[PDB]
Design a protein around this nucleic acid. Structure first.
Ligand SMILES: [Zn+2]
Ligand SMILES: [Zn+2]
Ligand SMILES: [Zn+2]
Lengths: 52, 604, 380, 54, 154
DNA sequence: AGGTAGTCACAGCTGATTGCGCT
DNA sequence: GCGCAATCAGCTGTGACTACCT
């Protein structure tokens, strides 16, 4: 059901590599990017499905 | 020699760092070469090192090569002399050659041309310039069985004697242990005994400069020597073989792996050699286009080495084939030559030059060393990074995206250990969702997708769930051919599934996306071949593995060949927009239902 | 024999040593050999040009619904047409583009022949969602193009581009008579098909002097359009071709001055949307009409309004910069400081201009020959 | 033999539903040690649970 | 193609048994055999299936959707005049021949020499321009060998 | 106290049998 | 009744898991 969908999503999308990555992001830069060069390099090195 | 930090330090061994850093090279005492790519003399140093040593890794900045006895044999086979190579290595050292390499190089290069093997009148002979070496090897027990009947003196002219044809592999293995390696030189310019054919490639099939270098190294002083050329599948590999066959100008025999590769080679010959169909023959027990009296013959393995009863027509064809010399016997997918029955194939036919072609020279069981004497030395090793920098090879963006194990599956994975856990991490629901998301995304962006998946039992429910074409493998010949033929030129269908069938050199069309799930354990050859099916960021391929399982270790240990080739595997841990759309196994009910059907094997 | 069956090339034989350390100097030459990899020409092809009145004919039949090019032929065709219009107006200052759409055995002039780039792009974007019906009629589109281009001056190069998707055309009359009429009228017709070669298109292109091509894929489509972008070569001196055109100054209006008169743009008055009531814009030198875009021909007095920098951007082709004489540093007896960058001259070669006899380093010589296109010394 | 083997296991593997035994510890009466300590022993696997009860 | 049947059809002693296959820079022909249609039913022209509606519909669909990919003329051959006329009558009865009509013109070869000549002339003139046409004939007819379809024709 | 021939999975090949089609 | 294509038996390659002697 609707509750089962939410439970499965919570179990899957955040099982191992989110319980620390999300916490680090909450304790991260937060503000704007360092330079525009970093953003361009990140966009170049990111996959097409990660830029949408 | 010292182990202060566990690292072999050679600071005192090679202090010749005169002035000052202009030589982009480092030598090792035991043996190793480190080359700096960011040098103005990079191309010349690379050309010098290729002709003398084989690479061990080619990253973007600091290449590493290895010095081996066979590499030095190949170097001295070309017009390069001992003095030239020694003085040029000393020229670009920046540290001074240690006094363990010069002695090693001298010892390797001294005994190169002392012993030669020749074929004449369907007879194998071993000829030596120095008569003493014959008496040196006379006391060897293994050699004495080759002569029959004992070959009392075989007085000719230069001392030579006959050897047993079927025991040539044994003497080839023994000679290198005796520090007298054999050389396979075919001086096809002047034979006057062998009936050369009128093959001549059309003057319209241009070849790239690296193919020019490989062919030029093949024919160094007007003669052809047996060797191995390693080129990517997407790059021009059949063209090199066709050009070599045309240059040899003799009766050619081509050996493939599958029953469809022979058609591929026939098409390549008809495209780039201008040969009449009467001379071209294929001997694979399908049409039998009169192989008797032919110029070029194409066949496959597992047919020339049958240990069982053979067909009547095939028996006569083999009897005819084993009664004449062959020019430039070409082997395809040479990596799987060192087998129980494939090794004897070279001993069942007689040929002057044996040219092996492959894309993935890596193999387990450390049997590649045997290939050094089975055929010859590793002649050319193409640099994949610079090959894709020129734009002629698609720059594939490698990805290693893993998925967590679902709770309903990890308990069973840790519960069972007797080979029953393969299906558990093979059919991971999270991996299934990731694969489905990738399929949908790359279909929305209109990219051809090839999904490799071993363990076809899992592939059944993996493919029928999405209702997409798949190749079980033991289906038929027409169905696979028609599926692969309509895969390319059809906008409606642009994704196919292959189960260990595409792990060889086939005619698969151009694709941009490859997704491999649950392949073999540590088959670097298989992963390299699968990667080769994509290149021909134009393209990119993904590998899906399950965390906290043996598949992680398998993926880690199978990608080392590609990182040696220069590729980098980016790790993807989150998929953007995974929850944006609906995917299969959304709820836990079907996930836990999957356990029963995945444990329903019970192969006991 | 074969080239590769002879002697193996030893490329490493180039480097040599005489003092046990001279190799560095050799690689320095390699560094000097690294530069000057260009021909000192950004284009290197046609050094002149000629005005073009190009017509683009777009098929609107059911064949445009085919999904050979994602999503369909019409969408990719219109996207590449927008790109082609942008590039064509970028590389041609005083050219004109008209658009005709063929549909249901009829031809409709989607956009009049003009030099405005924005109008054509908007028309194409509107036409993206058109309905594909009927079959194309090359005869009607060619007749309309010939009728419009018949009265154009002879010095202008009259060109018609046809994007023929469907393989069949309905001709109300004989088309070869129309082809002969076009040949007598000196009209260049080029066709870029999508499915396969058609005999009538090949005959038309061959007889009218144009080029006929067939699309292999989207990349080949873009390459063909880019090839069509380049203007045709022109004679050294053909006729008395001159055209009266103005140069409107971009005068903005500020409330600080008392001469700030708000005015509606003449071009914006013709649109369905509310015309922009801006402070100011481009004023016609003849009738003081207000416009917001350039180059736009004036609707009132008929004068053409062209931006001077666009015309001046191609003047360097008329007066190419002569190559400087390469002189070794030792053989030059003079100052060792570059005239352009004031840097010390340490390279093995120093370039001296033939007019002002000034010294320029490798970097300054490359910069002058590639971008500046004028010798700084000769300017003074 | 093959065509009967391929179907003999179809009904064999369709009967069992639960493979893992229920591990729910059904502790019996609590045993009282010193310092108000209480121990519970599982009647299924012999698991011992010692706790302090307020 | 069969060099073993002519020496035995008529008294002959061949000493050649030679065949030649032309080659060019590219494959100039793409022969292919189309079996079952989109309904997975064979389109064989068997005598027991000459009047079958399914094979007639499949032939009509093949001729229709084929006529939109190959331009400027298609030459189609039928087994016999009777079968050809029955098939075109069946296509006329259905609303399928009209779809072929708007793509290419339909021309029918008959036994009349003058009619055949004028039909060939109008087919040639229709293929000269972009209208395109279909020439329907029989394999065993005087038009089969009397003319050669040079490039851009058929 | 530490290592290799059987065994299993999944593919390939060729050598016969073996039911299916008939203007 | 004959002929072509589908089918299986037997052997082999590749990679990995497992039970007794220096
Ligand atoms: Zn005006
Ligand atoms: Zn300067
Ligand atoms: Zn000057």
């Amino acid at each position: 059901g609707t509750s089962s969908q939410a439970e499965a999503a919570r179990i899957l999308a955040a099982s191992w590599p989110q319980n620390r990555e999300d916490e680090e992001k909450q304790k991260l830069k937060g503000g704007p990017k360092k330079t525009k060069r970093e953003k361009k390099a990140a966009a170049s090195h990111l996959f097409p499905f990660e830029k949408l | 020699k010292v182990d202060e930090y566990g690292a072999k330090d050679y600071r005192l061994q090679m202090p010749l760092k005169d002035d000052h850093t202009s030589r982009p090279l480092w030598v090792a005492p035991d043996g190793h070469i480190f080359l700096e790519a960011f040098s103005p003399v990079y191309k010349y140093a690379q050309d010098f090192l290729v002709a003398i040593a084989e690479p061990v890794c080619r990253p973007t900045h600091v290449h590493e090569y290895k010095l081996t006895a066979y590499s030095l044999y190949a170097a001295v086979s070309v017009g390069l002399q001992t003095s030239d190579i020694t003085e040029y290595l000393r020229k670009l050292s920046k540290t001074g050659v240690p006094d363990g390499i010069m002695q090693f190089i001298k010892l390797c290069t001294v005994s190169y041309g002392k012993v030669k093997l020749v074929l004449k009148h369907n007879r194998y002979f071993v000829e030596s310039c120095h008569p003493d070496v014959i008496q040196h090897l006379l006391q060897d027990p293994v050699i004495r069985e080759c002569r029959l009947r004992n070959s009392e003196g075989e007085a000719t002219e230069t001392v030579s004697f006959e050897v047993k044809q079927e025991m040539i592999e044994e003497l080839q293995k023994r000679c290198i242990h005796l520090e007298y390696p054999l050389l396979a030189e075919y001086d096809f310019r002047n034979d006057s005994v062998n009936p050369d054919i009128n093959i001549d490639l059309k003057p319209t099939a241009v070849l790239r400069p690296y193919q020019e270098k490989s062919l030029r190294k093949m024919f160094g002083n007007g003669r052809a020597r047996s060797g191995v050329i390693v080129l990517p599948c997407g790059a021009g590999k059949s063209l090199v073989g066709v050009t070599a066959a045309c240059t040899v100008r003799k009766r050619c025999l081509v050996l493939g792996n599958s029953a469809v590769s022979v058609e591929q080679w026939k098409a390549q010959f008809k495209m780039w050699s201008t040969i009449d169909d009467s001379q071209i023959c294929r001997f694979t027990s399908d049409a039998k286009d009169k192989p008797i009296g032919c110029s070029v013959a194409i066949s496959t393995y597992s047919m020339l080495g049958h240990t069982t009863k053979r067909s009547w027509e095939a028996e006569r064809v083999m009897e005819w084939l084993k009664t004449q010399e062959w020019g430039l016997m070409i082997l395809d997918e040479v990596h799987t030559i060192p087998a129980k029955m494939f090794r004897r194939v070279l001993t069942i036919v007689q040929a002057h030059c044996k040219l092996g072609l492959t894309a993935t020279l890596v193999r387990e069981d450390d049997k590649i060393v045997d290939l050094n004497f089975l055929i010859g030395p590793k002649l050319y090793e193409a640099n994949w990074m610079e090959l894709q920098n020129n734009g002629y090879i698609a720059k594939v963006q490698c990805a290693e995206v893993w998925c967590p194990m679902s709770p309903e599956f990890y308990r069973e994975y840790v519960a069972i250990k007797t080979k029953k856990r393969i299906l558990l991490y093979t059919m991971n629901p999270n991996k299934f969702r990731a694969c489905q998301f990738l399929i949908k995304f790359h279909e929305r962006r209109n990219d051809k997708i090839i999904v490799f998946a071993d363990n076809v039992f899992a592939l059944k429910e993996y493919a029928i769930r999405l209702n997409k074409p798949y190749i079980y493998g033991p289906t038929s010949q027409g169905e696979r051919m028609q599926i692969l033929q309509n895969f390319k030129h059809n906008p409606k269908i642009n994704t196919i599934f292959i189960s260990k069938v595409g792990d060889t050199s086939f005619d698969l069309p151009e694709a941009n996306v490859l997704i491999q799930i649950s392949s073999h354990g540590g088959s670097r050859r298989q992963e390299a071949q699968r990667l080769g099916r994509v290149l021909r960021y134009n393209a990119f391929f993904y590998s899906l593995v399950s965390q906290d399982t043996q598949e992680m270790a398998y993926s880690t240990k199978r990608q080392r060949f590609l990182v040696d080739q220069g590729y980098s595997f980016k790790v993807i841990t989150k998929l953007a927009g995974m929850e944006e759309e609906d995917l299969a196994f959304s709820t836990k009910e079907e996930q836990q239902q999957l356990l029963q059907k995945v444990l329903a094997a019970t192969d006991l | 024999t074969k080239r590769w069956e002879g002697g193996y090339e030893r490329t490493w034989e180039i480097l040599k040593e005489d003092e046990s350390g001279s190799l560095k100097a050799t690689i320095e030459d390699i560094l000097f050999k690294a530069k000057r990899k260009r021909v000192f020409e950004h284009h290197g092809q046609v050094r002149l040009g000629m005005m073009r009145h190009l017509y683009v004919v777009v098929d609107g039949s059911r064949t445009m619904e085919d999904q050979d090019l994602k999503p369909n032929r019409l969408t990719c065709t219109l996207k590449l047409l927008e790109y082609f219009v942008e590039e064509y107006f970028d590389q041609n200052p005083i050219s004109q583009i008209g658009i005709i759409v063929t549909k249901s055995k009829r031809a409709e002039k989607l956009t009049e022949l003009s030099g405005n780039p924005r109008k054509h792009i908007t028309s194409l974007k509107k036409a993206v969602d058109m309905t594909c019906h009927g079959e194309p009629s090359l005869y009607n589109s060619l007749s309309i193009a010939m009728q419009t281009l018949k009265h154009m001056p002879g010095h202008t190069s009259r060109e018609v581009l046809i994007i023929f998707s469907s393989l069949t055309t309905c001709d109300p009359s004989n088309i070869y008579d129309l082809i002969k009429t076009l040949k007598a009228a000196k009209i260049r017709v080029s066709v870029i098909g999508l499915s396969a070669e058609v005999r009538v298109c090949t005959v038309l292109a061959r007889e009218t002097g144009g080029t006929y091509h067939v699309i292999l894929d989207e990349s080949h489509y873009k390459e063909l359009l880019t090839h069509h972008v380049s203007p045709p070569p022109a004679s050294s001196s053909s006729e008395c071709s001159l055209i009266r055109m103005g140069f409107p100054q971009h005068t903005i209006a500020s409330l600080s001055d008392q001469d700030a008169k708000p005015s509606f743009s003449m071009a914006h008055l013709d649109g369905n949307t509310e015309p922009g009531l801006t402070l100011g814009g481009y004023f016609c030198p003849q009738c003081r009409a207000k416009y917001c875009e350039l180059p736009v021909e004036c609707k009132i007095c008929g004068l053409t309004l062209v931006s001077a920098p666009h015309l001046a951007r191609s003047y360097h082709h008329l007066f190419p910069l002569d190559a400087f004489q390469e002189i070794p540093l030792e053989e030059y007896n003079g100052e060792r400081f570059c005239y352009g960058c004031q840097g010390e001259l340490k390279d093995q070669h120093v370039y001296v201009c033939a007019v002002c006899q000034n010294v320029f380093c490798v970097d300054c010589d490359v910069f002058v020959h590639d971008s500046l296109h004028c010798c700084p010394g000769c300017i003074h | 033999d093959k065509k009967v083997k391929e179907l003999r296991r179809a009904v064999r593997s369709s009967v069992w539903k639960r493979e893992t035994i229920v591990h729910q510890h059904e502790y019996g009466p609590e045993e009282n040690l010193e310092d108000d300590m209480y121990r519970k022993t599982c009647t299924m696997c012999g698991h011992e649970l010692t706790y302090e009860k307020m | 193609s069969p060099l073993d049947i002519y020496p035995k059809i008529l008294d002959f002693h061949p000493v050649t048994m030679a065949t030649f296959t032309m080659t060019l820079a590219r494959v100039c022909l793409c022969p292919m055999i189309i079996g079952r249609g989109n309904d997975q039913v064979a389109i064989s022209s068997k005598f027991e299936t000459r009047e079958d509606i399914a094979v007639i519909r499949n032939y009509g669909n093949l001729l229709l959707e084929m006529s939109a990919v190959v331009p400027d003329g298609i030459v189609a051959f039928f087994t016999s005049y009777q079968y050809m006329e029955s098939t075109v009558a069946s296509w006329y009865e259905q609303g399928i021949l009209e779809n072929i009509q708007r793509n290419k013109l339909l021309f029918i070869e008959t036994q009349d020499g003058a009619e055949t000549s004028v039909a060939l002339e109008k087919y040639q003139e229709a293929c000269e321009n972009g209208r395109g046409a279909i020439l329907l004939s029989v394999a065993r007819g005087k038009v089969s060998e009397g003319i050669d379809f040079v490039h851009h024709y058929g």
